Amino acid sequence: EIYFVELVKEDGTLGFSVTGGINTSVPHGGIYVKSIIPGGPAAKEGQILQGDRLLQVDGVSLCGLTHKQAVQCLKGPGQVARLVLERR
Template structure:
């Protein structure tokens, strides 16, 4: 799952670490590679009920 955009004033926007282009690898330790988009969204909504979600992402480093 690639992050396309960060919604303004969302928790991800306020946190500042997630960026467009990041690839979501897991949600609270549950791998999401190859999973349907709806499954990942439902997983994130469920995890967010606790007030915290641990995301593991992969970021491509741009050459300078």
């Protein structure tokens, strides 16, 4: 099931990390939520769960991206990150 999260960054972070990418052995080469920081943006917003698949960041699909490219997607200059995830 696909869900939508709007996160306001705090001190440059969204309060979660990711694993995966096409150059890794995760299922489908996808990007998955790894850790979530207590009291961070993702934790406070409440929807994101560890293990969910991150499909899209700010309207840009992560399909086909390497690990480094997805991380770069999450570390951009905008104050707000618009994320699309799969419950996994």
